[PDB]
Structure formats: structure tokens, C-alpha cells
Amino acid sequence: SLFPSYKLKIIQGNELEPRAVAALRPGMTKDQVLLLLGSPILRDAFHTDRWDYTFNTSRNGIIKERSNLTVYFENGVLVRTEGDALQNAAEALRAKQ
Amino acid sequence: VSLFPSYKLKIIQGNELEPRAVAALRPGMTKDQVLLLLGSPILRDAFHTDRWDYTFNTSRNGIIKERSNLTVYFENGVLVRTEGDALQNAAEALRAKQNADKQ
Amino acid sequence: VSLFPSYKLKIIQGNELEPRAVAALRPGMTKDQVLLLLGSPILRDAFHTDRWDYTFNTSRNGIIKERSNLTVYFENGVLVRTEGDALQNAAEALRAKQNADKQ
Amino acid sequence: SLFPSYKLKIIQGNELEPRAVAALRPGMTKDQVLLLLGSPILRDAFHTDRWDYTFNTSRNGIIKERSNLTVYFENGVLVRTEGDALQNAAEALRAKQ
Ligand SMILES: [Zn+2]
Numbered sequence: 001s002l003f004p005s006y007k008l009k010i011i012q013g014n015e016l017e018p019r020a021v022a023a024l025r026p027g028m029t030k031d032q033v034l035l036l037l038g039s040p041i042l043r044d045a046f047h048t049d050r051w052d053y054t055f056n057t058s059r060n061g062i063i064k065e066r067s068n069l070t071v072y073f074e075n076g077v078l079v080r081t082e083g084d085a086l087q088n089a090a091e092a093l094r095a096k097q
Numbered sequence: 098v099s100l101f102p103s104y105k106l107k108i109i110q111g112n113e114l115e116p117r118a119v120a121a122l123r124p125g126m127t128k129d130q131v132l133l134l135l136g137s138p139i140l141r142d143a144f145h146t147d148r149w150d151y152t153f154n155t156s157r158n159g160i161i162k163e164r165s166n167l168t169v170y171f172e173n174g175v176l177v178r179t180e181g182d183a184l185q186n187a188a189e190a191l192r193a194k195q196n197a198d199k200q
Numbered sequence: 201v202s203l204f205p206s207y208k209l210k211i212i213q214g215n216e217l218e219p220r221a222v223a224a225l226r227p228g229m230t231k232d233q234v235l236l237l238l239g240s241p242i243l244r245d246a247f248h249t250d251r252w253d254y255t256f257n258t259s260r261n262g263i264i265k266e267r268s269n270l271t272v273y274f275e276n277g278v279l280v281r282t283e284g285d286a287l288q289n290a291a292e293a294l295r296a297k298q299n300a301d302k303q
Numbered sequence: 304s305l306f307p308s309y310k311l312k313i314i315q316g317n318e319l320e321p322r323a324v325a326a327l328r329p330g331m332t333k334d335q336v337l338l339l340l341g342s343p344i345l346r347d348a349f350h351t352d353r354w355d356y357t358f359n360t361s362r363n364g365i366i367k368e369r370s371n372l373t374v375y376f377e378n379g380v381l382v383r384t385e386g387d388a389l390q391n392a393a394e395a396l397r398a399k400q
């Protein structure tokens with residue numbers, strides 16, 4: 001064969017919950033974000049005030065995108081968020097309407 | 098740059114524990130090598146992240162019986178360390194398959 | 201969430217102009233639909249970018265004869281506008297194929 | 304067939320030039336970045352001081368990653384850079400050594 005052939009496994013899990021992501025607001029305590037999103041995987045020193053999440057995004061039975069989310073804290077409350085998951089959840093809810 | 102005009106790709110979507118794959122991990126493996134062996138973890142950019150985390154399922158009769166976690170660490174682009182109970186659960190499943198060959 | 205346990209994927213790597221594909225663009229197409237028709241543009245995250253830019257090549261006898269640019273715009277997740285000389289170059293190639301059928 | 308089958312085209316072009324990306328330094332004029340990287344595609348008002356680039360990253364004949372680069376300017380000189388391409392070029396040169 002002139003063209004190669006490979007087998008790739010895409011890990012399933014942590015499907016994006018748009019309502020949970022679109023629920024984050026500045027001023028929420030760390031405990032609030034835990035109740036909304038669950039604990040992140042990393043919990044070292046550098047990630048005490050920076051929590052990383054990664055979600056799977058599926059459409060029509062296919063995993064299409066890994067959507068990342070970062071939550072920043074100061075004095076135990078949420079100060080800002082960034083990542084693809086924010087837009088991913090916003091447009092997912094707007095498409096559901 | 099030289100590129101294949103086309104290639105074929107079979108995708109598996111799941112998180113079932115693959116004992117033989119986990120048991121084949123070796124120090125010095127590249128990130129490309131680990132990806133083809135264990136699968137693409139739930140990371141936006143695995144190529145440029147030095148720690149990957151997996152959560153595997155062990156199911157029998159269609160029921161998840163236990164969950165196994167695996168963490169792989171990379172330094173200078175090669176594998177150097179592993180953590181998580183997926184390592185021991187994989188070794189126990191391989192040895193259980195051996196004991197069953199001997200009845 | 202319901203997922204296919206596995207699916208097959210044939211990948212084409214190139215930037216050759218595909219006249220029929222360009223000529224099949226319609227208003228209202230989703231981003232998933234445009235991706236399967238024209239290809240995945242050189243964008244990190246096309247799903248969440250509202251403008252995509254393509255640069256196509258027209259080659260004959262293995263020599264790039266001209267380059268065609270295409271820009272697609274999305275609003276509310278569907279296609280609404282196109283720019284670039286790939287549109288006219290694709291229409292001219294399709295009509296040239298027709299004229300050749302008539303000798 | 305129980306499993307679907309799809310055809311996907313991955314667009315070739317704009318291959319990452321690690322030396323060019325690793326050459327960017329604060330204080331370079333816009334003209335310098337043009338000579339190093341060429342012009343970006345977007346050139347509207349919002350992108351007068353923010354230039355976006357995207358590159359293909361290939362290994363062993365396969366396109367593996369689309370690597371993005373953003374260059375920020377103030378008073379016509381480069382102030383900072385961000386994107387995957389920076390790490391992508393750094394580790395590509397370190398692996399070439
Ligand atoms: Zn990367």
C-alpha cells in the first residue's frame with residue numbers, strides 16, 4: 001500500500017456540561033466551583049489558585065473537540081475564567097434555544 | 098516538507114482499560130508513541146503538556162466494575178514516570194489471563 | 201452521551217483546488233458541513249472561529265500554475281458569505297470541463 | 304456497516320519555520336516581523352497591533368498540529384508574543400540539537 005494506516009484511540013469521558021460552565025460568575029468561592037464542576041485533577045502549589053479542567057465535546061456520536069477551562073482565584077473567590085469551554089458552552093446553549 | 102498524500106485512520110472511542118498496552122510502557126517513549134499505545138488523553142494539546150492523566154473503566158457484562166487512573170510524565174519529550182492504580186490493575190488482569198490458560 | 205465505538209477516517213493532505221466542492225457551497229451550511237466539503241483550514245480551532253481562509257493550488261503536470269484564495273464567513277454557526285478568486289477559478293474550471301465534453 | 308466512514312481533507316501549507324519564530328524579540332518593528340514571518344492574513348482595525356499567524360506542524364509525513372502565534376505591538380514595536388508556536392519552535396530546535 002502506498003498510504004499508511006493507523007489505529008488511534010480517543011479517550012471518552014468528562015463530557016462538557018454547558019449549564020455548569022455558563023454558571024460560573026466572579027465572586028464564587030472555591031467551594032462553589034467544586035459543587036458546580038467537581039475537583040480538578042491537578043492540586044499542587046502552582047494550581048492552588050489556578051484550576052484546570054478539560055472536557056470532551058461530542059456531536060452526532062463523534063468526539064469533535066477537547067475544550068479547556070481555567071479558573072483563577074484570589075482570596076478564595078473566582079476572579080476570572082478563560083478557555084475554549086466558555087465559548088463552547090455559550091454557543092451550545094444558544095444552539096439549544 | 099514531505100507529506101503522505103493520504104493515509105487511513107481507524108478511530109476507537111472509549112475508555113476501557115487495555116492491559117497489554119499499559120504493560121508495554123517503557124522509559125524513553127516519545128509522546129507520539131504513548132499516544133498510539135494508550136490513546137489520546139482528554140487534553141487540548143497533549144504534544145506540549147508534560148503530564149497526561151487517564152481514567153479507565155473495567156467493565157464486565159456491560160457494567161463498570163472499577164475505575165483505574167493513570168498518570169504519565171514526560172521530560173525532554175520522552176516518558177520517565179508513571180503513577181496510578183491502572184498499572185497494578187493491568188498487571189493483575191494479565192496474570193489472571195495466564196492463570197486461566199492453565200485452568 | 202451516545203458515541204460510535206469506532207469509525208473509519210480517510211485523510212487527504214493537500215491544498216489542490218476542488219472545483220466541485222467550492223461550487224457546492226450554500227448559505228446556511230454548518231461549520232461541520234463546510235469542513236467536510238472544503239477541508240480543515242490552517243486554524244487551531246475552526247469550530248469557534250467565524251472566518252476561515254484557504255489558499256488553494258492549481259497544478260498541471262506537477263507544476264503549480266496559480267494560487268486561489270478563499271474566505272468563508274460564519275454567523276450563528278452557519279455560512280453567510282464567501283470571498284476570494286477561488287470562487288471564479290472553480291466556476292471557470294467546471295465550465296472548461298463542460299466545453300471539453302462537447303469537443 | 305455498524306461504524307461510519309468519513310473523508311477529511313487537511314489543508315497543507317504555512318509549515319512552521321522554527322528559526323523564524325524563535326527569532327522574535329521585544330522591540331522589533333512591525334517591518335522586522337514582516338521580513339521574518341511575512342504579512343498576516345487579517346489586517347483590519349482590531350488587528351493593526353495584533354497580528355495572528357497559524358502554521359502547520361508535520362512529523363514523519365503527517366500533519367500533526369496547527370500551531371498559532373499572536374504578536375502584539377505598541378508604538379510600532381513588538382511588546383509580547385503568545386501562542387503554541389513559541390513552545391512548538393523552542394522544542395523543535397532543542398530536538399534538532
Ligand atoms: Zn501544541
Ligand SMILES: [Zn+2]
Nearest residue numbers: 084245247248
Ligand atoms: Zn473550540
